[PDB]
Amino acid sequence: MVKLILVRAAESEWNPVGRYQGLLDPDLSERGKKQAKLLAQELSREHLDVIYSSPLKRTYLTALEIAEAKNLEVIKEDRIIEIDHGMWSGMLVEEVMEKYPEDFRRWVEEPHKVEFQGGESLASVYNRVKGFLEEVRKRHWNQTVVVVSHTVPMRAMYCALLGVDLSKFWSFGCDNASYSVIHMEERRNVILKLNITCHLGEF
Amino acid sequence: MVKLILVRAAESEWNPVGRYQGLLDPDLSERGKKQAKLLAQELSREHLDVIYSSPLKRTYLTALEIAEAKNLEVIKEDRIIEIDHGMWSGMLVEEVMEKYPEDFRRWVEEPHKVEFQGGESLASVYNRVKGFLEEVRKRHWNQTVVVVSHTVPMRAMYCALLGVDLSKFWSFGCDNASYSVIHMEERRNVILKLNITCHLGEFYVEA
Ligand SMILES: [Cl-]
Ligand SMILES: [Cl-]
């Protein structure tokens, strides 16, 4: 099997105020930098074979702490980059709700149908992360793989892994510096642990 | 929303050797007794409104610790009882694999089509836990509900909660004295946390 460890980036400077980032690239927050160290300590217990990360700072810096703790390299991977939120990028959740209430409603209620104006469709995110996961399954069979990514590609990944409709997108928790443990087996994928944050304690 | 905390019984005497219990009723192991206390300690940190438990000892004893820590009464619920494993009940996994390889293969490969001889179907389990969850959603809106159950009903519950086929049965981890946090929202259910065992520390066993 593949032991797949799916990690969300530690907290960015934009997360606590709820500003959509998409492809935009803020640094980790001070809290985030601490979260990443704690997560790296937590994952140091495991034998790791490979670490993939979205190339954006928040993910890459999180990946780098895990790699440094285990003396591995980080392999950048564009296919697990955050969705292009288009015009939402730079906007607070409250601003989106006020300026684009109907688009916000579609996002919450029927995420699978969304295409961000000036940006990417959720279908597109699903396609790219699924392709990545298929290649990982083949290439890294019988290994432990860490994948450092963001909310939207991660939630799409859970849909692909379970073989469920993209409409189930919101049914998975995805907190900063969390990890999930998936076993990619011969006939199915198994979510053994989802959205673990215990290592963060107070953070 | 409903904050639904789905808990698997702490370790029974039969869990570490892999003997199928079903409706057979073994005690918690000494380790499991400690697990239940650690879990109860963990869940004592937040407000709980109601605790439902399968009436089998392994679940009920786990539920009793959580209930006592919060000044609640355990509500016995037959609809979250373990599947009737029928002829497998009392057999080790390796014995089942040896004696009934075809039925074991069906169990692993196509769980949604399984029915244990002298026992219950997986479809039956799905039906009864789904009805239970529907009633919980209506009765306990804006409350925190603990449900103490077993691997098979819990896995069926995840299928029902996600509104997905019973063929996804095996795709969810379910360890002794673990908890999952689900939000039952208006339009969907969200698995916020699945199969959390961090509170157990050195007393955590996968198996
Ligand atoms: Cl989001
Ligand atoms: Cl089982």
Curated annotation (Swiss-Prot), chain B:
Keywords: Amino-acid biosynthesis, Hydrolase, Serine biosynthesis. The keyword Hydrolase applies. Its EC number is 3.1.3.3. Disulfide bonds: none annotated. It catalyses: O-phospho-L-serine + H2O = L-serine + phosphate; O-phospho-D-serine + H2O = D-serine + phosphate. InterPro entries: His_Pase_superF_clade-1, His_PPase_superfam, PGM_Phosphatase. GO terms for molecular function: L-phosphoserine phosphatase activity. It comes from the Bacteria. Pathway: Amino-acid biosynthesis; L-serine biosynthesis; L-serine from 3-phospho-D-glycerate: step 3/3. One of its GO terms (cellular component) is cytoplasm. It is an enzyme of class 3 (hydrolase). The active site is at A9 (tele-phosphohistidine intermediate), H150. One of its GO terms (biological process) is L-serine biosynthetic process. The keyword Hydrolase applies. The record marks R58 as: Important for activity. Signal peptide: none annotated. Activity is not inhibited by EDTA in vitro, nor enhanced by the addition of Mg(2+). Homodimer. Can also form a heterodimer with PspB. PANTHER family: BROAD-SPECIFICITY PHOSPHATASE YOR283W-RELATED, HISTIDINE PHOSPHATASE FAMILY PROTEIN-RELATED. Belongs to the histidine phosphatase superfamily. Metal-independent phosphoserine phosphatase family. Catalyzes the dephosphorylation of L-phosphoserine to serine and inorganic phosphate. Is poorly or not active toward D-phosphoserine, DL-phosphothreonine, 3-phosphoglycerate, para-nitrophenylphosphate, and fructose-6-phosphate. Does not display phosphoglycerate mutase activity. This is Phosphoserine phosphatase 1. The lineage of its organism: Bacteria, Pseudomonadati, Aquificota, Aquificia, Aquificales.
